[PDB]
């Protein structure tokens, strides 16, 4: 069977970081969702792109189990998720049931503010780093891509792709995302 992603879209998202790794893993033919955290209307992101999400996060999270739970960033946007019960109970559930866990830049704080993957190494937007060591609960790496297990995280905007393409490459393996990878023009 297809594999399947659950993208959490909230208010003040950054709209690169959410829109470049649900292309991408539809490239790759992977089932996405585009859940809005507050309800199926349409999300202002951080850069005030409006993105309309395929359902609610309500509704989705009736629809697991995820191959892949996607937490883009985006500071308010991050704030969004790691103040969000519904967030909490499905990172636990991916966390419990040994499911992939991605978060790009702001991202990964949601997993601090959940207890997400304690012990992993982790990156994340160099401005982040600080909140996301808070207690020092995962070990920093200044790699473009981590992925410590089932823990995979990412750096900026610039680092989207690289990003989508570890997530291809964890649900779908190595020869998928280097084809969806050549028709990209990437660096």
Known sequence: ???????????????????????????????????????????????????????????????????????????????????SAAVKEILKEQENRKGLIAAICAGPTALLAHEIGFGSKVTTHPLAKDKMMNGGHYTYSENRVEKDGLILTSRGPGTSFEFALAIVEALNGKEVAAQVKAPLVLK
């Open 1 to 83: 069977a297809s594999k399947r992603a659950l993208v959490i879209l909230a208010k003040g998202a950054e709209e690169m970081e959410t829109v470049i790794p649900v292309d991408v893993m539809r490239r790759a033919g992977i089932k996405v969702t585009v859940a809005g955290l507050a309800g199926k209307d349409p999300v202002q992101c951080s850069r005030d792109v409006v993105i309309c999400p395929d359902a609610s996060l309500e509704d989705a999270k009736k629809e697991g189990p995820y191959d892949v739970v996607v937490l883009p960033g985006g500071n308010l946007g991050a704030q969004n998720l790691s103040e």
